């Protein structure tokens, strides 16, 4: 897990030897793994590249971070408001700093991860201090231009 780098944000043009060919300049990528879905039978955008040394994986994570690969925000990492279609290049501290401009955050946010890879699932949950920050996130942040990924902010629970 230390020598392997988890890549997120892969489109349909990216393939299993294509990621190994793109990561060959960063370091000696020994193997590439792409988990296939059960309903569609294709990649879900997240994969893994197992290299030989941890320094090559660190250089690939520091070089290929927030890159625009196949029209997709590909990024390598070390393997009541709901935000969907978020970029995997952002972290919890980056999401807390991005959410601090609209309103005040009550605590540190959390992002959902896949049970197989564990880098990024695609959705996240963040809680605001009051309902005014949630309304400002649903008015402004729900549709704002993020890092090559159109996010969507919505209410997790609402009572009619």
């Amino acid at each position: 897990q230390d020598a392997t780098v988890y890549v997120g944000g892969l489109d349909e043009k990216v393939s299993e030897p294509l990621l190994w060919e793109l990561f060959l300049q960063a370091g000696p990528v020994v193997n590439t793994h792409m988990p296939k879905d059960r309903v569609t039978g294709q990649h879900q955008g997240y994969g893994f590249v197992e290299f030989l040394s941890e320094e090559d994986a660190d250089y690939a994570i520091k070089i290929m971070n927030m890159i625009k690969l196949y029209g997709k925000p590909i990024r390598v990492n070390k393997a009541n408001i709901f935000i969907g279609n978020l970029d995997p290049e952002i972290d919890e501290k980056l999401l807390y700093d991005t959410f601090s401009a609209f309103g005040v955050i009550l605590q540190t946010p959390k992002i959902m991860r896949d049970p197989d890879t564990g880098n990024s699932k695609g959705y996240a949950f963040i809680n605001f201090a009051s309902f005014d920050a949630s309304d400002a996130a649903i008015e402004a942040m729900n549709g704002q231009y993020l890092c090559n990924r159109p996010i969507t902010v919505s209410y997790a629970f609402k009572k009619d």
């Binding site: 609209f102 309103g103 009051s130 005014d132 920050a133 400002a136 008015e139």
Partner: peptide, 23 residues
């Protein structure tokens, strides 16, 4: 976008004179 329409950011309501301001 030339300003911000947030309530707690750039708005004020003086209840002593009942004056509402927004910038």
């Amino acid at each position: 976008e030339i300003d911000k329409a947030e309530g707690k950011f750039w708005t004020h309501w003086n209840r002593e004179t009942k004056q509402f301001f927004l910038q």
